[PDB]
Write an enzyme that holds these catalytic residues in place. Structure first.
Site, PDB file in Angstrom:
ATOM      1  NE  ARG A 100      -3.404  -3.013   1.647  1.00 35.70           N
ATOM      2  CZ  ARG A 100      -3.458  -3.084   2.673  1.00 35.70           C
ATOM      3  NH1 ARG A 100      -2.985  -2.553   3.699  1.00 35.70           N
ATOM      4  NH2 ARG A 100      -4.594  -3.891   2.912  1.00 35.70           N
ATOM      5  NE  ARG A 154     -11.284  -8.555  -2.110  1.00 35.73           N
ATOM      6  CZ  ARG A 154     -10.231  -7.829  -2.043  1.00 35.73           C
ATOM      7  NH1 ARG A 154      -9.217  -8.575  -1.973  1.00 35.73           N
ATOM      8  NH2 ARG A 154     -10.310  -6.581  -2.205  1.00 35.73           N
ATOM      9  N   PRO A 173      -8.730 -17.641 -16.124  1.00 36.15           N
ATOM     10  CG  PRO A 173      -9.179 -19.400 -14.426  1.00 36.15           C
ATOM     11  CD  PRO A 173      -8.353 -18.060 -14.631  1.00 36.15           C
ATOM     12  CG  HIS A 207     -16.829 -20.720 -13.336  1.00 37.20           C
ATOM     13  ND1 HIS A 207     -17.889 -20.228 -11.993  1.00 37.20           N
ATOM     14  CD2 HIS A 207     -16.463 -19.431 -13.485  1.00 37.20           C
ATOM     15  CE1 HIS A 207     -17.822 -19.020 -11.979  1.00 37.20           C
ATOM     16  NE2 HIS A 207     -17.046 -18.461 -12.504  1.00 37.20           N
ATOM     17  CD  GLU A 208     -14.276 -19.946 -17.413  1.00 35.17           C
ATOM     18  OE1 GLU A 208     -14.039 -19.212 -18.232  1.00 35.17           O
ATOM     19  OE2 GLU A 208     -14.645 -19.901 -16.094  1.00 35.17           O
ATOM     20  CG  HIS A 255     -19.591 -18.479 -16.895  1.00 33.08           C
ATOM     21  ND1 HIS A 255     -19.124 -19.405 -16.075  1.00 33.08           N
ATOM     22  CD2 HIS A 255     -19.914 -17.160 -16.333  1.00 33.08           C
ATOM     23  CE1 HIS A 255     -18.967 -18.754 -15.030  1.00 33.08           C
ATOM     24  NE2 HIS A 255     -19.423 -17.540 -15.037  1.00 33.08           N
ATOM     25  CD  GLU A 274     -18.921 -14.722 -12.913  1.00 32.98           C
ATOM     26  OE1 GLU A 274     -18.282 -15.611 -12.429  1.00 32.98           O
ATOM     27  OE2 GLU A 274     -19.270 -14.741 -14.109  1.00 32.98           O
ATOM     28  CD1 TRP A 305     -10.547   0.367   5.698  1.00 30.15           C
ATOM     29  CD2 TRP A 305     -11.834   0.562   3.930  1.00 30.15           C
ATOM     30  NE1 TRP A 305     -10.304  -0.895   5.221  1.00 30.15           N
ATOM     31  CE2 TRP A 305     -11.306  -0.645   3.914  1.00 30.15           C
ATOM     32  CE3 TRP A 305     -12.607   0.858   2.970  1.00 30.15           C
ATOM     33  CZ2 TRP A 305     -11.539  -1.722   2.621  1.00 30.15           C
ATOM     34  CZ3 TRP A 305     -12.886   0.050   1.929  1.00 30.15           C
ATOM     35  CH2 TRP A 305     -12.233  -1.143   1.811  1.00 30.15           C
ATOM     36  CE  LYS A 348     -10.553  -4.656   7.488  1.00 29.86           C
ATOM     37  NZ  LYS A 348     -10.438  -5.827   6.609  1.00 29.86           N
ATOM     38  CG  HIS A 351     -11.901  -4.863  -7.599  1.00 32.64           C
ATOM     39  ND1 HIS A 351     -11.043  -5.799  -7.152  1.00 32.64           N
ATOM     40  CD2 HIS A 351     -12.493  -4.220  -6.383  1.00 32.64           C
ATOM     41  CE1 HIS A 351     -11.084  -5.813  -5.869  1.00 32.64           C
ATOM     42  NE2 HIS A 351     -11.816  -4.945  -5.354  1.00 32.64           N
TER      43      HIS A 351
HETATM   44  C1  LIG Z   1     -21.678  -1.104 -21.921  1.00 28.60           C
HETATM   45  O1  LIG Z   1     -20.306  -0.984 -22.295  1.00 28.60           O
HETATM   46  C2  LIG Z   1     -19.234  -1.547 -21.506  1.00 28.60           C
HETATM   47  C3  LIG Z   1     -18.123  -1.296 -22.244  1.00 28.60           C
HETATM   48  O2  LIG Z   1     -17.950   0.218 -22.314  1.00 28.60           O
HETATM   49  C4  LIG Z   1     -19.796  -3.211 -21.304  1.00 28.60           C
HETATM   50  O3  LIG Z   1     -19.004  -3.653 -20.053  1.00 28.60           O
HETATM   51  C5  LIG Z   1     -18.372  -4.759 -20.780  1.00 28.60           C
HETATM   52  O4  LIG Z   1     -19.146  -5.816 -20.139  1.00 28.60           O
HETATM   53  C6  LIG Z   1     -18.627  -7.175 -20.252  1.00 28.60           C
HETATM   54  C7  LIG Z   1     -19.870  -8.072 -19.758  1.00 28.60           C
HETATM   55  O5  LIG Z   1     -19.758  -8.235 -18.422  1.00 28.60           O
HETATM   56  C8  LIG Z   1     -17.363  -7.230 -19.681  1.00 28.60           C
HETATM   57  O6  LIG Z   1     -16.862  -8.575 -19.765  1.00 28.60           O
HETATM   58  C9  LIG Z   1     -16.586  -9.386 -18.402  1.00 28.60           C
HETATM   59  O7  LIG Z   1     -15.398  -8.653 -17.897  1.00 28.60           O
HETATM   60  C10 LIG Z   1     -15.157  -9.195 -16.530  1.00 28.60           C
HETATM   61  C11 LIG Z   1     -14.032  -8.274 -15.920  1.00 28.60           C
HETATM   62  O8  LIG Z   1     -12.865  -9.190 -15.870  1.00 28.60           O
HETATM   63  C12 LIG Z   1     -11.812  -8.281 -16.070  1.00 28.60           C
HETATM   64  O9  LIG Z   1     -10.649  -8.845 -15.094  1.00 28.60           O
HETATM   65  C13 LIG Z   1     -10.244 -10.132 -15.527  1.00 28.60           C
HETATM   66  C14 LIG Z   1      -9.270 -10.702 -14.604  1.00 28.60           C
HETATM   67  O10 LIG Z   1      -9.882 -11.767 -13.587  1.00 28.60           O
HETATM   68  C15 LIG Z   1      -9.559  -9.925 -16.871  1.00 28.60           C
HETATM   69  O11 LIG Z   1      -8.888 -11.202 -17.270  1.00 28.60           O
HETATM   70  C16 LIG Z   1     -10.321  -9.450 -17.708  1.00 28.60           C
HETATM   71  O12 LIG Z   1     -10.001  -9.096 -19.212  1.00 28.60           O
HETATM   72  C17 LIG Z   1     -11.203  -8.014 -17.480  1.00 28.60           C
HETATM   73  O13 LIG Z   1     -10.284  -7.156 -17.317  1.00 28.60           O
HETATM   74  C18 LIG Z   1     -14.877 -10.761 -16.554  1.00 28.60           C
HETATM   75  O14 LIG Z   1     -14.681 -11.167 -15.380  1.00 28.60           O
HETATM   76  C19 LIG Z   1     -15.998 -11.428 -17.274  1.00 28.60           C
HETATM   77  O15 LIG Z   1     -15.775 -12.897 -17.501  1.00 28.60           O
HETATM   78  C20 LIG Z   1     -16.631 -13.654 -16.772  1.00 28.60           C
HETATM   79  O16 LIG Z   1     -17.391 -14.378 -17.517  1.00 28.60           O
HETATM   80  C21 LIG Z   1     -16.563 -15.372 -18.415  1.00 28.60           C
HETATM   81  C22 LIG Z   1     -17.292 -16.075 -19.745  1.00 28.60           C
HETATM   82  O17 LIG Z   1     -17.477 -15.103 -20.742  1.00 28.60           O
HETATM   83  C23 LIG Z   1     -15.865 -16.252 -17.671  1.00 28.60           C
HETATM   84  O18 LIG Z   1     -14.972 -16.974 -18.311  1.00 28.60           O
HETATM   85  C24 LIG Z   1     -15.083 -15.500 -16.567  1.00 28.60           C
HETATM   86  O19 LIG Z   1     -14.547 -16.511 -15.617  1.00 28.60           O
HETATM   87  C25 LIG Z   1     -15.938 -14.630 -15.735  1.00 28.60           C
HETATM   88  O20 LIG Z   1     -16.733 -15.301 -14.805  1.00 28.60           O
HETATM   89  C26 LIG Z   1     -16.474 -10.823 -18.457  1.00 28.60           C
HETATM   90  O21 LIG Z   1     -15.377 -11.129 -19.442  1.00 28.60           O
HETATM   91  C27 LIG Z   1     -16.314  -6.304 -19.930  1.00 28.60           C
HETATM   92  O22 LIG Z   1     -15.408  -6.509 -19.266  1.00 28.60           O
HETATM   93  C28 LIG Z   1     -16.892  -4.828 -19.856  1.00 28.60           C
HETATM   94  N1  LIG Z   1     -16.033  -4.024 -20.188  1.00 28.60           N
HETATM   95  C29 LIG Z   1     -15.629  -2.975 -19.583  1.00 28.60           C
HETATM   96  C30 LIG Z   1     -14.577  -1.990 -20.151  1.00 28.60           C
HETATM   97  O23 LIG Z   1     -15.878  -2.907 -18.436  1.00 28.60           O
HETATM   98  C31 LIG Z   1     -21.205  -3.363 -20.952  1.00 28.60           C
HETATM   99  O24 LIG Z   1     -21.656  -4.631 -20.939  1.00 28.60           O
HETATM  100  C32 LIG Z   1     -22.161  -2.408 -21.766  1.00 28.60           C
HETATM  101  N2  LIG Z   1     -23.522  -2.795 -21.353  1.00 28.60           N
HETATM  102  C33 LIG Z   1     -24.646  -2.851 -22.095  1.00 28.60           C
HETATM  103  C34 LIG Z   1     -24.137  -3.182 -23.525  1.00 28.60           C
HETATM  104  O25 LIG Z   1     -25.681  -3.110 -21.893  1.00 28.60           O
END
Ligand SMILES: *[C@@H]1O[C@H](CO)[C@@H](O[C@@H]2O[C@H](CO)[C@@H](O[C@@H]3O[C@H](CO[C@H]4O[C@H](CO)[C@@H](O)[C@H](O)[C@@H]4O)[C@@H](O)[C@H](O[C@H]4O[C@H](CO)[C@@H](O)[C@H](O)[C@@H]4O)[C@@H]3O)[C@H](O)[C@H]2NC(C)=O)[C@H](O)[C@H]1NC(C)=O
Ligand SMILES: *[C@@H]1O[C@H](CO)[C@@H](O[C@@H]2O[C@H](CO)[C@@H](O[C@@H]3O[C@H](CO)[C@@H](O)[C@H](O)[C@@H]3O)[C@H](O)[C@H]2NC(C)=O)[C@H](O)[C@H]1NC(C)=O
Ligand SMILES: *[C@@H]1O[C@H](CO)[C@@H](O[C@@H]2O[C@H](CO)[C@@H](O)[C@H](O)[C@H]2NC(C)=O)[C@H](O)[C@H]1NC(C)=O
Lengths: 148, 596
Positions: free
Chosen positions: B151, B255, B328, B356-357, B360, B384, B459, B463, B487
């Site tokens: 930190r 967590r 994943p 899981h995958e 999905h 999820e 915080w 906590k 995040h």
């Molecule tokens: C409006 O527009 C925005 C973008 O401008 C859209 O936002 C996107 O939404 C999708 C759908 O949820 C997002 O996709 C998801 O992203 C999650 C974030 O993961 C981050 O962190 C991991 C590390 O753990 C990185 O590897 C990854 O690249 C990301 O940086 C993922 O966790 C999600 O995956 C989940 O589902 C898959 C199945 O497909 C599983 O395999 C995974 O294990 C997990 O459970 C998913 O990929 C996307 O990231 C969003 N973009 C942004 C920029 O935030 C909105 O959806 C859109 N709204 C509308 C159109 O209504």
């Protein structure tokens, strides 16, 4: 000429051989006054729309079969023949048409007409190109691949 | 002539082009993910730029059509989504600064790092070397040092950056309609219009608080057990009446206390529930780990994937010369071009992640007939939750014994059930209060309630009481623990975890009820029973055409999330949990600190 339909069977592994007025197995034992053949390429999910009476996007605007149809319909997969990574935009189809199309008729037009209320008189509000292309790619799955 | 049909005649014109552009953007993204090269990331950024620009014109085009002549839910959703997701309200002078602050936050989280104490040798990032020590390496000094070094090297300089980002994001949020940036994240579950299914964003916070209060009786006993075990292990600092030092939670921010579970072992004679050895024993490879998963999915009614999916899916990290990411992630390229990029070699965790995958992918496949703009039926909580419940159902020892991963000789005695139920509890109830506290704190910050000079004060006040965890080192306003998170730096919501925590248990109890399975919620095996699979497939194919509350009522019955599935899922665990926790002090001392 002598019409031999045997060369059609081994030409390609067709997955759709619908015949309406004649049983296919007897096709080699018949004589006809005249024969017409039409060829075009469409996507997989539209294959079902090629049938008499059936109503859909393609049938209502592109190719409509009359109810009194006595021919045959043949469709076989051609994914690997015309799949490119960049996109197979060379093929075109009518995205939408203003009016219904008469059976066994074709329309060749690209005038951008107003699909709204206020006359567009050019590209703008609800005024779009009647035609629209599509980028077939090899990585596509069934339903988004070229079919002859 | 009426705007209702004009909207659809405009929609179908650009639907195909939008599908193609999204497919191309996803193609570039997957190419860069598989091929880590400068040209590949250039193609990612260019394709994303075209997609974003097209959304920019689409926002104005949607704003052209008034929304007061629209009554169809489909048309309403499709018109409204492009209005805000393809536009920004902040002017250039503010939007550019907001983007720059986001990029700097991501860079400082990634580039900024700390390593071994007082050594200019090869260093490691948070997850490789620091969060690894926080997670599994049970050592007081190392975890205590890292918990502040990370930190001070990341969150310290990110604290002013996080404050400025909060202010800028609030400026963006309050402009059009929102009252804070937390209203954006609270809109993922807002339901309005339809009779019998109405919701308010403010009531969501009340629901989260009520769920935290419901989990409090279990969480205080869990805290008592953890404190007793910590005092047994480290009586030097931990007091028998105080809270839990944050470093001694099996991670940096508590967590998943899975390694903390090892210290708090209920029974030392626990039999073998691990099938990781069985992966080597029964010749399990990358293909099979998904093949029996597909067999289980088919046995419950879910159809398998096509061969094209398997010929475009990366189930093993390439390595060699073209390195990739082992994280994943299931990939939906578009137009039935599903892919994957993850690792499954020899472990049971590979089996669970495969389920899981697969869940999905099946969920995304089910609503393929829905329109492209309505393909957002993948509610993050619901998505999820489905991914977690499929692995939970497949992880039951009965299914493994039937398949062959386990043996009928091993039995579900009291020791076994207590052990794995408490192992799951240390990760679920371990994160529930922390998740609630983080969500409420960030909501208040984006609302501006928390003073910029008293972020850590509030915080830690929450906590010590709400979470019952006190910092092992006198952390103060100089650093910023939330800002040092992936995040938060990437501007990602965390209400997804809290929602899915109850959503998965609701789905599990609904599946067991629909299938009429004979057994407890911790041993619900629905492998060869597809009766609940029919309703599950119906919910899967519902998509973004009905409110999620309606689907929950049709499947679970309760419109809002309920803890009762968690309550009766942990009841056999709760029986042993009560006995070993009333002996110790159920409360904790907020004033007491681990640092003497
Ligand atoms: C409006 O527009 C925005 C973008 O401008 C859209 O936002 C996107 O939404 C999708 C759908 O949820 C997002 O996709 C998801 O992203 C999650 C974030 O993961 C981050 O962190 C991991 C590390 O753990 C990185 O590897 C990854 O690249 C990301 O940086 C993922 O966790 C999600 O995956 C989940 O589902 C898959 C199945 O497909 C599983 O395999 C995974 O294990 C997990 O459970 C998913 O990929 C996307 O990231 C969003 N973009 C942004 C920029 O935030 C909105 O959806 C859109 N709204 C509308 C159109 O209504
Ligand atoms: C609200 O919007 C939705 C989304 O468009 C409307 O659903 C539409 O319903 C019609 C009527 O069934 C569908 O037409 C069908 O087309 C198929 C061929 O695609 C044809 O075989 C059927 O016989 C039927 O004519 C239409 O496809 C469908 N829209 C989509 C995108 O699939 C809904 O009707 C609207 N609400 C109201 C009250 O109109
Ligand atoms: C689901 O049904 C299948 C089909 O019978 C079961 O698989 C067989 O199970 C029996 C007894 O468990 C074994 O003797 C066979 O060897 C299994 N067949 C194969 C090909 O492995 C399966 O066990 C059932 N699973 C559940 C949970 O009921």
């Amino acid at each position: 000429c002598v019409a031999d339909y045997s060369v059609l069977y081994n030409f390609a592994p067709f997955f759709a051989f619908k015949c309406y007025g004649v049983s296919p197995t007897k096709l080699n034992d018949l004589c006809f006054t005249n024969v017409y053949a039409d060829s075009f390429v469409i996507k997989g999910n539209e294959v079902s729309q090629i049938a008499p009476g059936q109503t859909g996007n393609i049938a209502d605007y592109n190719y409509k079969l009359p109810d009194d149809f006595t021919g045959c319909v043949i469709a076989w997969n051609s994914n690997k023949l015309d799949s490119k990574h960049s996109g197979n935009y060379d093929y075109w189809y009518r995205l939408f048409r203003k009016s219904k199309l008469k059976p066994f008729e074709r329309d060749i037009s690209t005038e951008i007409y107003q699909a709204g209320n206020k006359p567009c008189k050019g590209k703008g509000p609800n005024c779009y190109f009647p035609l629209q292309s599509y980028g077939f790619r090899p990585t596509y799955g069934v339903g988004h691949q070229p079919y002859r | 002539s009426t705007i209702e049909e004009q909207a659809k005649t405009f929609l179908d014109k650009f639907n195909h082009e939008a599908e193609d552009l999204f497919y191309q953007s996803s193609l570039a993204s997957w190419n860069y993910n598989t091929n880590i090269t400068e040209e590949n990331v250039q193609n990612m950024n260019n394709a994303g730029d075209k997609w974003s620009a097209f959304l920019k014109e689409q926002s104005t085009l949607a704003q052209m059509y008034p929304l007061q002549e629209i009554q169809n839910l489909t048309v309403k959703l499709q018109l409204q989504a492009l209005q805000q997701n393809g536009s920004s309200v902040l002017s250039e002078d503010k939007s550019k600064r907001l983007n720059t602050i986001l990029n700097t936050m991501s860079t400082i989280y990634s580039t900024g790092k700390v390593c071994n104490p007082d050594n200019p040798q090869e260093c490691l990032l948070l997850e490789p070397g620091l969060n690894e020590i926080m997670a599994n390496s049970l050592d007081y000094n190392e975890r205590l040092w890292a918990w502040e070094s990370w930190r001070s090297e990341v969150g310290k300089q990110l604290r002013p950056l996080y404050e400025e980002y909060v202010v800028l994001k609030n400026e963006m949020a309050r402009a059009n309609h929102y009252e804070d940036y937390g209203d954006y994240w609270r809109g993922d579950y807002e339901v309005n219009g339809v009779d019998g299914y109405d919701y308010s964003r403010g009531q969501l916070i009340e629901d989260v608080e009520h769920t935290f209060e419901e989990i409090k009786p279990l969480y205080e006993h869990l805290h008592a057990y953890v404190r007793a075990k910590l005092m047994n292990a480290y009586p030097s600092y931990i007091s028998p009446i105080g809270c839990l030092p944050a470093h001694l939670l099996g991670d940096m921010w508590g967590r998943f206390w899975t390694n903390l579970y090892s210290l708090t072992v209920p029974f030392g004679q626990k039999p073998n529930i691990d099938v990781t050895d069985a992966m080597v024993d029964q010749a399990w490879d990358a293909q099979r780990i998904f093949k029996e998963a597909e067999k289980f999915f088919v046995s419950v009614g879910l159809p398998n994937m096509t061969q094209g999916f398997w010929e475009n899916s990366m189930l093993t990290d390439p390595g060699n010369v073209q390195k990739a990411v082992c994280h994943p992630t299931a990939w939906d390229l578009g137009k039935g071009d599903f892919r994957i990029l993850m690792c499954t070699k020899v472990t049971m965790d590979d089996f669970l992640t495969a389920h899981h995958e697969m869940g999905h992918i099946q969920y995304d496949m089910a609503y393929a007939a829905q329109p492209f703009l309505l393909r957002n039926g993948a509610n993050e909580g619901f998505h999820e939750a489905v991914g977690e419940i499929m692995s939970l159902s497949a992880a039951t020892p009965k299914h493994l014994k039937s398949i062959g991963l386990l043996s009928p000789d091993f039995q579900e005695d009291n020791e076994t059930e207590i052990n794995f139920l408490l192992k799951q509890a240390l990760t679920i109830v371990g994160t529930l209060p922390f998740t609630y506290m983080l969500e409420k704190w960030r909501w208040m910050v984006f609302k501006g309630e928390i003073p910029k000079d008293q972020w850590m004060k509030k915080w830690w006040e929450m906590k010590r009481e709400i979470v019952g965890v006190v910092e092992p080192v006198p952390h103060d306003e100089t650093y910023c623990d939330p800002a040092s998170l992936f995040h938060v730096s990437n501007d990602y919501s965390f209400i997804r975890y809290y929602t899915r925590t109850l959503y998965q248990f609701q789905f599990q109890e609904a599946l067991c009820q629909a299938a009429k399975h004979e057994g407890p919620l911790h041993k619900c095996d629905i492998s060869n029973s597809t009766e609940a699979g029919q309703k599950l497939f119906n919910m899967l194919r519902l998509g973004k055409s009905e409110p999620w509350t309606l689907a929950l009522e049709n499947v679970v019955g309760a419109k809002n999330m309920n803890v009762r599935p968690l309550l009766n899922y942990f009841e056999p665990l709760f029986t042993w949990l009560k006995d070993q926790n009333k002996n110790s002090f159920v409360g904790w001392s907020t004033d007491w600190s681990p640092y003497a």
